[PDB]
């Protein structure tokens, strides 16, 4: 999938 586990959801594709 395209979601990336950055600390925040802004511009994470989640």
């Amino acid at each position: 999938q395209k979601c990336v586990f950055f600390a925040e959801d802004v511009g994470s594709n989640c």
Partner: antibody
Amino acid sequence: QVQLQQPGAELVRPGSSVKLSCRASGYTFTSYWVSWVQQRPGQGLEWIGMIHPSDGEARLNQKFKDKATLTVDKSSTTVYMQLSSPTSEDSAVYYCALFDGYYPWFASWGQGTLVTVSA
Amino acid sequence: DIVMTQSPSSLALSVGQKVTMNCKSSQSLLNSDNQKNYLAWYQQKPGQSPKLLIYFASTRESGVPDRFMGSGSGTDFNLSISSVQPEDLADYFCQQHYSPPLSFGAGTRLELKR
């Protein structure tokens, strides 16, 4: 084992097309983001941006917005970065790297391509 | 863009000695909800690609010897080695994995004292 195969060295003429290749193997090409990372002579690392090979979506570093074009060839599971208007300033080692699954750090790296810009 | 500062940029060491390398960031890397810090450490040796040591500030990548230890919180982080070995003579740099664009420190080079 995950493999990211990059050429050792590319010489690119000013105002010409730097198309750098990163051949992926040992994993599902279409599932994970592939980043490009810049290392100028002993200067520390710059994240250029990344591309998802499922559809070719590209998120760039703002610094490389007008400089880097990222693409993908699913049939040769290969990632390409293209540098527009390259100068001696862009002479560096360029790595491709894989996220550790969905986590934004780099478990797998290519050996890097030493790019020399010169006429 | 989050800015990563590693000072100093070289340390001179005897083998067997404990070394602590510092990494500061311009913004806190702590996530309040899970109480986890979003910093990675890497080892690089000349003419070689970087190697993952630590993620989430203090989790060792499997295969990484337990003499390597990550610590700290917010804007201040340390990579320690409890007994520096010859093979540990390398460059080490931090990377915030908090928010894009991803950013690295300029590294700290570990050298032998004489």
